[model samples]
Target chain A: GFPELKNDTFLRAAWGEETDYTPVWCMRQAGRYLPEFRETRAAQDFFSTCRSPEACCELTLQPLRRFPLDAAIIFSDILVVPQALGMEVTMVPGKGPSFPEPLREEQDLERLRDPEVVASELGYVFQAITLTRQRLAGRVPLIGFADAPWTLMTYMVEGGGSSTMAQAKRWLYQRPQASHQLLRILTDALVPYLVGQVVAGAQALQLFESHAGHLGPQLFNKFALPYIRDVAKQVKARLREAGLAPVPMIIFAKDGHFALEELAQAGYEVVGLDWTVAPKKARECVGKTVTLQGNLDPCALYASEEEIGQLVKQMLDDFGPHRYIANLGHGLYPDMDPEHVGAFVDAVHKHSRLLRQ
Target chain B: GFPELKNDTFLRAAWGEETDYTPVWCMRQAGRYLPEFRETRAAQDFFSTCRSPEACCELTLQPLRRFPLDAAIIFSDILVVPQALGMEVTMVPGKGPSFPEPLREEQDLERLRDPEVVASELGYVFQAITLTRQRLAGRVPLIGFADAPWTLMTYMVEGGGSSTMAQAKRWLYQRPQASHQLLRILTDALVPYLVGQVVAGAQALQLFESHAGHLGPQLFNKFALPYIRDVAKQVKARLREAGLAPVPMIIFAKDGHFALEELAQAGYEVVGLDWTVAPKKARECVGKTVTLQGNLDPCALYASEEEIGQLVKQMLDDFGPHRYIANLGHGLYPDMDPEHVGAFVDAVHKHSRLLRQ
Candidate 1:
């Protein structure tokens, strides 16, 4: 069992339970904006840093060290899953991660190993989760994440970040059999990988469907949501069979304002939103049963500290006191100021407490 | 004031007027997808092609020759406004429009020409508009469009296409005053230019806020939407003063799903959507007051003719019978088959007629 969480506020809030103050964390908190993060990153390149458990543990705890963040997300890349699934991923210092040879045809599926074997390949992630948990000492919950099946499929098919998931979406429309084959493979791998994180002391899991905005309702309902629901259900069942405490599941579909109602009912315990959706509107869409996380623009950190504080308070007020986890709607950009991030954390805590009182 | 548009269906649909069927068109309808467009491009480069009235007229009508489209958009680049303002733009063939000296700082603002004179510099566009109208000889309603202020500002600041509008957003967060100043100048220039298009026989205006999805709700409302509203409001006023009828305005905020509620109320006659937002959800967000256009996943064209027809029927069924325009959610990609474009046009017309009947 993991050490007792000193700050169960994040966990409490994730389950739509009451908290003294709303729990706050920034996505990509231990990231490039922090001087020390860059210093640590200097030692090893991107993928290498993710592979090093000691390094992952250090980066995961970096944000917690300076700010009273209620959760520590392991410093790992989402692309790791595709890499573990037998794609050769390379991270140029300037360019983000990419596959040297993207999967293009049904024939290319042969290049990947069996989905059942993917969990064993991703043992390093579980190792990092366990190591980070050991280092975190239950100071706060540690979040474990994997790219949602749809998102990973986009990366694998497009080979990298895309403005349009055109090539990938084509697979869904033109080659239905191949698309289903790939999506199922991704979902199968993700279930055990996520279960492994929970087994390794992760308190929560977030599935990042970052490319979800690419599909409309018809496509998302058919391709993304079912598999998303499947991942959550399968992972929960697997963990239950293993007799592990159930971790809250968060489905973060960036720019997914269209899918809010369906996503809320998609079996995940919490729904995460991008900054584009208004907190009040989002709450209405998702309803009150599930907890909500995020809705602040990460670029808001570029504002002055005072402005950042005010914006954070406005965000907190919108999200209100219950069933909310304060976070930037998206990950922090490299150019943002660290002190502004600190301001964001402080504002969420301060305003939430006062609002409750 | 101009040649009577034989096809008033698109214009009628734009004003929420009931049509016998959904009026159909595609963004970038006159694009590289057709062999005729490529043959024309072989003679001149992209921006040069935009400058030639003869070339622009041919390209604008190429799709109409191939499909029974209800409207024609003037073939031009959104970056033309920046070019008129003294940014040295280079059309890098395969790469998109770029500025060698992109405006990144407040000091760079002084280098731009007066916004009032921007129309004079863009005489080529108005010339093309009138020429295309003459060439059409009352074939279809002609669409005149400009990049929305925020979108133009992104190109001006970033120099070209960007995955993240990082530098442009920094101007919003760090240099709010300058951001507003640049946005106003763009709005100022766009008003007269759009009015000039109306004077030159264009029947409708669309402001392409192509970068709308880059900002979340806060920044969008603050930086993007206000300018968007201003352009529409100001352009209408200018057209009236010039004794020209105020043409229908379409705010095609490409990925502006987040701002739909506001966009519907932002003084435009039509709200254009990308493929990401659900037709049903987008209708709810925008309400039934304004006409809705677009949201078919462009990649769906890669599917067979039969599948395209089926998808169009479902799309029409969801959108229902009134105040809708059937179009691809975005532009047709270069690799897309022209036959598929014909399939899309045929399907929208055939299905809308069937559904309405």
Candidate 2:
């Protein structure tokens, strides 16, 4: 229906090709921060909507109707893979995601299986992706994503989201082999999950390492980055073997400031950065070979529209338009005003064009 | 009984002058990770030890005895100033520092006054500093520190340690004028507190901007950095007027990667970096004028002794010999083995000298 996304600006830039204007998308573009999203969500809570293919498909299209975003990330949670693997995952309001029974010993690692063995369990996510891609119908590119292996292990060990990641790090620092076994299992599960999205019509794939910042440089290299690299390499290879074009894989390692150069050394075609990383410095560190995505602070949207315009213009100038894909450094906070989001999209297009001229 | 500190290698490096080998010190160098420190702390809890001048002094010397470090930091909590100003401060184990009644309104600003007015109340801290210096007797320089105004406000508003600092940031982002008023009062109070340490025998001053990383570049410039710059400038001016050599100030903005260039413009002679910032990149950003301190990942200490040695060598090579002070990117985690600390110090000294040769 969309002519197979030949001129998909996001994909082109993500492969480090030039574009007329940089593509922009918010990380949680179709999230609850949108008024329409909240209105629909008022009827069914977040987890229910996430689990239902039809509901998620409808919600995923909510942002495209309201704003001129260059891409739509599929409405899915990173924790869904664990849920699909038979781990009990729940969203406790105000507290965040929790695992009723978290991985504690060698037995937990033994329980996880390859995605093919559990494909039936993750059928809903694939259904959601397929339905959402059909709904997108070439209006814009649709992105599919999964959590990075190390980050998944972090949630599995901590039993939920953690600020310090003490449990995860304890395993990593104290019991190295056990942590690696968990990572390997998650990596095996991730390949089929991500590949299924491509089969279902996702134009791009992103691996979200939301908790990547907690790892120090050594651990990141030995454990996190290698597994991420393997997933990207294996996923692309599988796509090539299947006679489909290799879908661009964007690795968004949030708060992973130290490992940028090493990440460049790995095989990810595009690197997504958190707000703390300076684009110019990142450009220098990773060099110009890979495409750069992200990192305006989502909170900056709280400023007046004029202030937002100036900030976007500054980022455009700093990154330049050639190999840049604009995005918020992280996901939108639940309290962010939707009007501000609309204003942010307008500013990105308006200011980025002006900068090019 | 003490020799002149002018010839001390640590003092020379602290002043941004040339030094023989790089000066090294750990944040919380004298605290609970060490067995000796644990023995002392076992008898008296943290608050009691801090309150008693003799115990604080004894604990401050504990680390120096264990490791041949270049400096000793006075053993005192940053929140003691707020305690002296009549706020109820207590350390809750497992959770961090807390106040029973937090400063929430304009009236609360009136409670803080000139440090000289409360000098008697803070006599224990100065006594601790003098006693620690007297015991060291020129073994190394003594470093003293206080929390930056914004960091203190974070604790004050949250009423304790915060993971996200939402309450403090809400006040700062939404109510700038009110937050600035509190910052101004803190700036006045902090100057005298830090100056008292220098007068009582602290050889160097380090201002810990622990939460500086939370603000985005724009908000950080507007709120935190400017006030910090103001404090540093006032501290220098006061020292000059008192007919003393201006004590060198080290600004350690942990996780504040966005602010290095701006911090260079803020006039501090030395800047402390966290592990997230690579030393080579930091040198490029801050330039040759500012002396650089830090950045080994503290978690690296958990690795084998050989691995710790390799990490220390890498940091030394990245930063070079002159104009760099070796330190951990952050404080040592409580569970870190004391043997690792010894290995780390030996590695730093052993490797750094090879580079010098």
Candidate 3:
């Protein structure tokens, strides 16, 4: 049972229910920016840090200690799912994640573990989530997330971060049947992993289709959207079968502005947006029902605290507090000042309350 | 006088006039993909090649020699305008342009030559344009291009290419007046230089707003759009005063989807797009009056010839034939096969004609 759910504002806002304010969170809040986070991270490598439940618990609570954020997302990387599926990922000191010997052909499918067993392999993550939730004591709702199938496939095929997903996209045009086969494998893995998070006490799940912008509407519909819908539909179905209340699902397709209408129809309760999306236009695309998260430019924090406050004020006015969640459009950079992040959180709280009055 | 332009199909299609078929060209058509371009490049460095009219003319014609491309864009780098404005830029042989001392402070304005004298500094570009036109012998329309004011400002601030124009974008937040001042400086230089290209016989003009995606809507509307509008207005003013017919102007804001409506309303006759924009949606934003150029995914050339053909056929159906010219959404990569590029050209020709029939 949930621990009497002390702060449910983020959850209510996510479900498009009325709330006192637009509940706020920053992506990568529990990241390297804080002095304590750096000190903690200094002791262990990234995945080793993720694998330890106590470290994940402490990192998840570090930001909450400083700011009265409305959500507590479990600290982990999107690549963890791939690592569970037998891909070798190394986190470069500064360059981010890299996969070695990426899956190339249909024959490479045999190397991945059975999707049915992926949730069990990812039991470490659920343990992290369960531990974090109990430690949070409902201080704020905890969010569980994974890379959307299309985004994960990019890393698996390109074997690393790509400015242009050219090789992986080439796989789509050249080896399309293999592309679909790999996508299905990813979908099968994600459904169970996402379901496991909910059962282990995550109040919500977010699918990060971060690479969505790589494909325009045509390829996204053919390859990405179907699996996105499948993940949500199957996860909810599994939760219902287990007699647990279904958690709200968020689909944050980082640059997928072209497929907003389809995403709104893709079984997500919230559609996350990148900074490029205009609030009014995003609402117009996703329509009035589905809640919208994000879209402040993460680079906005490079400005002075006053500027960050002003940017947040303007964003809150655009979102207007109803059926909205306040967040940065992308994850925080390691160099960003945590105080400026405080300015952002305070601005959303201060302004949204004033706007409602 | 400009050359006779033996192939007027590109010009006609740009103005929404009927054409026998969709006129096909490519961004960066005169580039490293061709072995001939490399053979010529081994003789001189990048800017030196731009400085020599014979070299520029030969590079411009290399692609035309291999394929019956409908247009021949002048072989010149966008960084030339920055260099002419008294900044030193270097070509690293295999690497692209680099500025050793990127302008960071408003005080750095002192180092730039007066924008008024920039046309004289860029005399070589005009000379190349004239020489290329005459040497082309009415072969095709020769396009003249420059970096858009916002894009040039990015290079001037970042000193080179950046995945995120964070430091430059910070200038917009922290020192907006400085941002505006640099944009104006670039615009002043660009207008006269563009007019000079027309006087020296460029048949068309393109302003490559390649870094537009770095800013989201709010900052783009503030920092980027005003200058974009000013560039078009001032160039047409200068061209009309010189008693030259207004050459069609294109605004190719590579990832600036947020500004499509505003860009369409900006003075350009054609709106160029990257592949991320859906053709139908782009048509809606720009409306039906303006012609559209470009939007094939540059990576699509990696596919088989048959797949490239099928991709082009699908693209033509999406764009339809009216008020459209065919081009790749972004520039060609150096690794792409010239034969595949030929396949793309053939597909556009075959499918567009069949669609009309």
Error of 2 at A264 (Å): 4.3
**Best model number under DockQ:** 1
> What is the overall TM-score of model 2 with all chains considered together?
0.90
Query: What's the candidate order when arranged by decreasing TM-score?
Result: 1, 3, 2
Evaluated at residue A275, the lDDT of candidate 1 is: 86
How accurate locally is residue B238 in candidate 2, as Cα lDDT from 0 to 100?
Answer: 84
Poorly placed runs, candidate 1 (over 4 Å)? none
Question: Which residue runs does candidate 3 get wrong by more than 4 Å?
Answer: B93-95
- DockQ for each numbered candidate: 0.83, 0.40, 0.74
Cα-based lDDT for every prediction: 0.89, 0.81, 0.89
lDDT of 3 by residue, A84-170 (tens): 999988787877788868888779889999888898888888898899898888778999999999999999998988878888998
lDDT of 1 by residue, B198-274 (tens): 88889999888889988988899999989888888888888888777899999988878878999999999999989
Scored against the true structure, residue A273 in model 2 reaches a CA lDDT of: 85
lDDT of 3 by residue, B108-184 (tens): 98999999999999898888888889999998898999988999999999999887788898888788888888889
lDDT of 1 at A287: 95
Model 2: how far residue A225 lies from native, Å: 2.5
Span of ten consecutive residues with least summed lDDT in model 2 chain B: B1-10
